[PDB]
C-alpha cells in the first residue's frame, strides 16, 4: 500500500486526510481508503501570517498523525482565493519555510487551487464513489458543488479551441481519456452570497426579524428573481454555462455541498436521495417563505439553518434553473451528507 496526505485548507478550517491506496495496471489508484483525518479551526486565510502563528497552526493540524515520511499536498480553496495574491504570498512563504525545517512531511505542493481545479476534484470524487470511472460509460455524468464560498459545475465536453483552456481539463483515468468542462463562481457559494440578501424580505419567512429591523415577507419567486440578478448580471452564469450544457447534455446530475443538507432536513420531503428544482421551490415557498416564522421556529427549534430555507431553496433554483439552464422537472441526485463525500479523494486519483 502507498500513502498520501491531502490538506483541504477551507473557509472554516483545515482538514488533513491521510489515504492508503494501491495502483492498478493503468497507473491509477484503486482501493483508496481514508486511514486518518484531523480538522482544526479557524480557516487558514483568517490567521495572522507570521512564523509563530503558522507554526502553531500546522503543528496542531499535523502533530498526532500516525505516519512518518509521507507526501503531502496543501491545497487552499475559496477562503484564500478571496485574498489578494500579495497577502496570500505571506502565508505561502511561511508555510514553505515551515515544511523545510522538518523531514516527516514531504511537501509536494502548497498552493491555492483554482475553482476550476476544485471542480475537477469534485467530479473525480463523486464518480469514484459511484464506481463510474473504471469502465467506458456512454452516460454523461455532471457534478455540482453547492459550496459555502464558491460553487462548482463540471461535465464532460470535447476539447474546444474557442473556450478558455482554464475551463477545460484533460486527464486519463483507468486507461480512458477524459475531457471535462469545469467552472467555478467565486462569491456565489451560499455563505458568501447570503451576505447580500439578509435584509431582503422576499427571502425570509413571514415576520422573521431582519437585521435592519424590517420583517420577512417571503415569496420564493421574488427571492429567486433577486438571486438570479446576482447570478446572471454579475457572475454571467447563464451566458457562460447554458450554451455549453445545451450542446453537451448530461444524462445524470449529482450534487454535493449544502443542498444535500437542506434536502436531508426534516422540513423538506425528498425521496431516493434526489430532488427536482420544481419541488424544491414549491416546498420552500409553501413551508418557509409564506409560513409564519414564530410558529415554524417553535416546530423545528433545532435546525440552525431553518431560518435560511426560503433563501436557500430560492437560491438553488436560481442557480440550477435560471443559471445553468437545467429543466425544473429534471431529477438532481444528491450525495447523502452521511456518506462524507470529500473532494480530496480526487487529488489522490489525479496526483498520487
Ligand atoms: N441544513 C443545511 N442546509 C443548507 N446548507 C447547509 C446545511 N447545513 C450545512 N450547510 C452548508 O452547506 C455548505 C457546504 O457544505 P460543507 O462544504 O460540508 O461545509 P463545511 O465543510 O462544514 N464548511 P466550509 O469550511 O465552508 O467548507 C456550507 O456552507 C455549509 O454551511
Q: What is the 3-state secondary structure (H, E, C) of the chain?
A: CEEEEEEEECCCCEEEEEEEEEECCCCCEEEEEEEEEEEECCCHHHCCCCHHHHHHHHHHHHCCCCCCCEEEEEEECHHHHCCCHHHHHHHHHHHHHHHHCCCCEEEEEEEECCHHHHHHHHHHHHHHHCCCCCCCCCCCEEEEEECCCEEEEEEECCCCCCCCHHHEEEEEECCEEEEEEEEEEECCCHHHHHCCCCCCHHHCCECCECCCCCECCCCHHHHHHHHHHHHHHHCCHHHHHHHHHHHCCCCEEEEEEHHHHHHCCCCCCCCCCEEEHHHHHHHHHHHHHCCEHHHHHHHCCCCCCHHHHHHHHHHHHHHHHHHCCCCCCCEEEECCHHHCCCCHHHHHHHHC
Q: Is the peptide bond before 42 cis (omega within 30 degrees of 0)?
A: yes
Angstrom distance (rounded) from CA 321 to CA 305: 23
Q: Where do the domains of the chain lie?
A: 1-113+342-352, 114-341
Report the alpha-carbon distance of residue 62 to residue 45 in Å, rounded: 18
- Residue 99 labelled as part of a binding site: yes
Q: How far apart are CA 30 and CA 128, in angstroms?
A: 10
Is 156 touching ligand 1 by the criterion CB < 6 Å?
Answer: no
Rounded CA-CA distance 302/135 in Å is 44
Q: How many CB atoms lie within 10 A of CB 249?
A: 10
Q: How far is the CA of 150 from the centre of ligand 1 (A)?
A: 11
82 exposure class (CB count in 10 Å sphere: 0-12, 13-18, 19+): middle
Q: Does 129 carry a binding-site annotation?
A: no
* Residue 122: other Cβ atoms inside 10 A: 28
Question: How far is the C-alpha of 119 from the C-alpha of 125, rounded, in Å?
Answer: 10
Rounded CA separation 38/341 (Å): 15
Q: Which residues of 166-192 are buried (b: 16+ CB within 10 A; e: fewer)?
A: ebbbeeebbeeebebbbbbbbbbbbeb
Grid cell listed for 95: 508555510
Neighbours of 229 (CB within 10 A): 12
Contact 316, 277 (CB under 8 A): yes
- Say which residue the cell 503543528 belongs to: 59
Whether 86 and 123 have beta carbons less than 8 Å apart is answered as: no
Measured in degrees and rounded to the nearest 5, phi and psi for residue 28 equal: -120, 135
Q: Which is the closest atom of ligand 1 to the Cα of 191?
A: 29
Return the CATH superfamily for domain 114-341: Exopolyphosphatase. Domain 2 (3.30.420.150)
Whose alpha carbon is nearest atom 7 of ligand 1? 261
State the first-to-last Cα distance of the chain, in angstroms, to the nearest integer. Answer: 12
Residue 147 Cα to ligand 1 midpoint, Å, equals: 7
206 in a labelled binding site: no
Task: Let me know: does 231 contact 188? Beta carbons within 8 Å.
Answer: yes
Pairing of strands 141-146, 252-257: parallel
This structure's resolution (Å) is: 1.6
Place of cell 447554458: 242
**Cα of 4 to ligand 1 centre, how many Å?**
26
Of 257, 255, 281, residue with least CA distance to 333: 255
Q: How far apart are CA 345 and CA 173, in angstroms?
A: 14
- Cβ(262) to ligand 1 under 6 A? yes
Burial grade of 278 (CB within 10 A; 0-12, 13-18, 19 or more): middle
Residue 304 CA to ligand 1 center (angstroms) comes to 12
Is the beta carbon of 284 within 6 A of some atom in ligand 1?
no
> How many of the other CB atoms lie within 10 Å of CB of 165?
11
Which residue out of 126, 257, 314 has the highest number of ligand 1 atoms within 8 Å of its CB and is therefore the one to mutate?
A: 257
Dig out the grid coordinates for 256 from the structure: 454535493
Q: Quote the CATH superfamily of domain 1-113+342-352.
A: ATPase, nucleotide binding domain (3.30.420.40)
| Ligand 1 contacts CB of residue 151 (under 6 A) | no
Which phi and psi (to 5°) does residue 27 adopt?
Answer: 65, 35
CA 99 to ligand 1 center in whole angstroms: 30
Give the Cα separation of 352 and 171 in Å (integer).
13
Number of Cβ within 10 Å of residue 194's Cβ equals 16
Domains 1-113+342-352 and 114-341 alike in fold: yes
How many angstroms separate the CA atoms of 37 and 16, rounded?
5
Whole-angstrom Cα distance, residue 2 to residue 70?
Answer: 9
Amino acid at each position: 500500500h502507498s500513502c498520501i496526505a491531502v490538506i483541504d485548507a477551507g473557509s472554516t478550517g483545515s482538514r488533513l486526510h491521510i489515504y492508503s491506496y494501491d495502483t492498478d495496471d493503468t497507473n491509477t489508484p484503486i482501493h483508496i481508503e481514508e486511514i486518518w483525518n484531523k480538522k482544526i479551526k479557524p480557516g487558514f486565510a483568517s490567521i495572522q501570517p507570521n512564523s509563530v502563528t503558522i507554526d502553531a497552526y500546522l503543528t496542531m493540524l499535523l502533530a498526532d498523525a500516525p505516519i512518518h515520511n509521507i507526501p503531502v499536498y496543501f491545497y487552499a480553496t475559496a477562503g484564500m482565493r478571496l485574498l489578494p495574491q500579495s497577502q496570500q504570498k505571506k502565508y505561502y512563504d511561511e508555510l514553505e519555510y515551515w515544511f523545510r525545517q522538518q523531514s516527516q512531511w514531504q511537501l509536494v505542493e502548497a498552493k491555492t487551487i483554482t475553482g476550476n481545479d476544485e471542480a475537477l476534484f469534485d467530479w473525480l470524487a463523486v464518480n469514484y464513489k459511484l464506481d463510474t470511472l473504471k469502465s467506458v460509460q456512454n452516460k454523461s455524468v455532471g457534478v455540482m458543488d453547492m459550496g459555502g464560498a464558491s460553487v462548482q459545475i463540471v461535465f464532460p465536453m470535447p476539447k474546444n479551441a474557442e473556450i478558455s483552456k482554464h475551463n477545460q481539463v484533460e486527464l486519463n483515468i483507468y486507461g480512458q481519456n477524459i475531457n471535462l468542462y469545469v467552472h467555478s463562481f467565486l462569491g456565489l457559494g451560499q455563505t458568501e452570497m447570503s451576505h447580500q440578501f439578509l435584509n431582503s424580505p422576499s427571502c425570509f419567512a413571514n415576520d422573521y426579524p431582519l437585521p435592519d429591523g424590517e420583517s420577512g415577507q417571503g415569496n420564493a419567486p421574488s427571492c429567486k428573481e433577486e438571486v438570479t440578478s446576482l447570478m446572471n448580471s454579475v457572475h454571467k452564469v447563464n451566458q457562460q454555462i447554458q450554451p455549453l450544457l445545451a450542446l453537451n447534455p448530461v444524462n445524470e446530475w449529482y450534487s454535493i455541498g449544502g443542498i444535500s443538507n437542506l434536502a436531508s432536513s426534516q422540513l423538506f420531503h425528498f425521496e431516493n436521495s434526489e430532488l427536482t428544482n420544481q419541488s424544491l421551490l414549491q416546498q420552500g415557498d409553501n413551508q418557509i417563505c409564506h409560513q409564519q416564522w414564530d410558529i415554524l421556529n417553535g416546530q423545528y427549534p433545532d435546525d440552525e439553518y431553518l431560518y435560511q430555507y426560503c433563501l436557500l431553496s430560492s437560491y438553488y433554483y436560481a442557480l440550477m434553473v435560471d443559471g445553468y439552464g437545467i429543466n425544473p422537472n429534471q431529477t438532481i441526485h444528491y450525495i447523502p451528507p452521511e456518506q462524507n463525500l470529500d473532494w480530496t479523494i480526487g487529488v489522490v486519483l489525479h496526483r498520487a
